[PDB]
């Protein structure tokens, strides 16, 4: 599993459950091409987005649908979504985790790149 | 000044100086139109992006050019940039500050919104 | 002003106002001695904690009273407080800003250090 | 496992490995009483600190030895350590994860409290 996403909620102190996540890859013409998608689990995690075969080097965008998340909780949020854009490079380690911590007016994100 | 950006550097314990910032506004046709740009000062602050008159209601994208910042420091970072996308001024004019904290493999951003 | 604190609120998208801050200094006997205290203003900023003369070399603890802040807003938070502990002025006088971002179950803090 | 700690490194984009962590419980006289300790694993995680039996309600402090961590990497850090102080309450969910993201002049921490 080369690409995982984990999302936490800083207001409730819990995983962010049932958040839609869409991943895109940058195409040669500079447009965003759909690549993978899913909803986070009870543990705030999304696995099995892709295989090693399909996950080639390039620029990827992970879009997290935070607006729908907050509204479903009755909270008015600031952002239209949260977007994480990065380069996958074969020289570095091969397993990528994109982790995000959400609040209504703020978010933080880090990368954990292993083995 | 209705739209400001302030950026700090978590590795140096200092303001993030000379960070390029580009702002876009979603157009009636649904693509990103260039709206304003600038770079942070020695205090890590960017003022004078726009005016009250020109900063009308819309969906704005503030793109903080984190990769160019780290690369100019000779460091290889993870992200291409940090984007903050939000609806602005839909309840009348407000003043917005986007505050950010940068590390090579992480960033945090928050918004400070003032005014009736 | 050689020691300042600035605090933002991630839930309201605003400065964190009326946050109590207590600073302690480790004493020759190795316990925490009270050093200074204050509360943040409407801009989320706390100035005037100490003076250049009194802010000598040592190990300082800046305790940001996050629980009292959230409880005064009628919210039940997780942490008792946020502590930032650091050696100061060991290479001569510097100016320090401790910047923090608060949510009910999370906080972030960073330091900005200026001067030769 | 009622109490877990997970530590990440924002400079390298990796787990924070082999970081000493000491947990204390507040005693009736307001002093900090040693409770549990360990070093984070290859995945930045520390498990098996305590049992449900010993983990009673009260105030706890999780001290992370970040200074030693950064110095072992050749980096001069700002903090003497990172401390996370919180109340364990039986009314809320029963599994606590304390997560921390480290940089030399900064750290962030959140709580993930589940089932
Ligand atoms: O398996 C992981 O990576 C976990 C994790 C631990 C810490 C965080 C976290 C902690 C702090 C910040 Cl600022 C950010 Cl962006 C992320 C996170 F999002 C996830 C423990 C769940
Ligand atoms: O002018 C402000 O608002 C200041 C400020 C204070 C705190 C931060 C800060 C502190 C922590 C985080 Cl996680 C974030 Cl995203 C921002 C910040 F970026 C800037 C004091 C400089």
A35 touches chain B (CB under 8 A): no
Residue identified by tokens 């209601």 is B57
Cα within 13 Å of Cα(B44), Cβ side: 19
SS3 D7: strand
Asked if B112's CB is within 8 angstroms of C101's CB, the reply is no
Residue identified by tokens 């409880």 is C71
Ligand 1: distance of its center to the CA of A99 in Å?
Answer: 6
Q: Return the structure tokens found at A29.
A: 């013409």
Mutate to test the interface with C, among D24, D57, D70, D84 (most CBs of C within 10 A): D84
Residue identified by tokens 């928050």 is B110
> Alpha-carbon distance A89 to A91, whole Å?
6
Longest CA span, chain A: 44
Q: Residue C10 is nearest to which of B13, B101, B110, comparing CB atoms?
A: B110
In degrees, rounded to 5, the angle at the alpha carbon of residue D34 between the alpha carbons of residues D29 and D39 is 155
Ligand nearest to the CA of B6: 2
Residue identified by tokens 């960073």 is C110
Chain A neighbors (3+ CB pairs < 8 Å): B, C, D
Task: Write out chain C in H/E/C secondary structure.
Answer: CCEEEEEEECCCCEECCCCEEEEEEECCCCCEEEEEEEECCCCCEECCCCCCCCCCCEEEEEEECHHHHHHHCCCCCCEEEEEEEEEECECECCEEEEEEEEECCEEEEEEEEECC
A101 touches chain C (CB under 8 A): yes
Q: Is the CB of C4 under 6 A from ligand 2?
A: no
B57 CB neighbours in chain A (<8 A) are: none
Asked if B63 and B79 touch (Cβ cutoff 8 Å), the reply is no
C113 touches chain B (CB under 8 A): yes
Ligand nearest to the CA of C101: 2
Asked if B23 and B76 touch (Cβ cutoff 8 Å), the reply is no
CA-to-CA dists, residue A32 to A5, A26, A29, C24, C99, angstroms:
19, 5, 9, 52, 36
Q: Measured on CA atoms in the order D15, D16, D18, D23, is the torsion positive or negative?
A: negative
CATH code: domain A1-115 is 2.60.40.180
CATH code: domain C1-116 is 2.60.40.180
B97 CB neighbours in chain C (<8 A) are: none
B99 touches chain D (CB under 8 A): no
How was this structure determined? It was done by X-ray
For the beta carbon of residue A11, count every other beta carbon within 10 angstroms: 19
Report the residue of chain B nearest A81, measured CA to CA: B85
CA-to-CA dists, residue B87 to A65, A66, A80, B32, B59, angstroms:
15, 14, 7, 13, 4
Asked if D84 and C79 touch (Cβ cutoff 8 Å), the reply is yes
D88 touches chain A (CB under 8 A): no
Asked if B59 and B24 touch (Cβ cutoff 8 Å), the reply is no
Asked if A19 and A40 touch (Cβ cutoff 8 Å), the reply is yes
Ligand 2: distance of its center to the CA of C11 in Å?
Answer: 14
Q: Is the CB of B108 under 6 A from ligand 2?
A: yes
Kind and range of the H or E run holding D69: helix D66-72
Q: Residue A110 is nearest to which of B106, B109, B113, comparing CB atoms?
A: B106
> Alpha-carbon distance A4 to C110, whole Å?
28
């Amino acid at each position: 599993c080369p690409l995982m996403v984990k999302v936490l909620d800083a207001v409730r102190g819990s995983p962010a459950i049932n958040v839609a996540v869409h991943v895109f890859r940058k195409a040669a013409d500079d447009t965003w091409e759909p690549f993978a998608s899913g909803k986070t689990s009870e543990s705030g995690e999304l696995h099995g987005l892709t295989t090693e075969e399909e996950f080639v080097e390039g620029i990827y965008k992970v879009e997290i649908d935070t607006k729908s998340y907050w509204k479903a909780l009755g909270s008015s949020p600031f952002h239209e979504h949260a977007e994480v854009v990065f380069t996958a490079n074969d020289s570095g380690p091969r397993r990528y985790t994109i982790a995000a911590l959400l609040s209504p007016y703020s978010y933080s994100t880090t990368a954990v790149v292993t083995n």
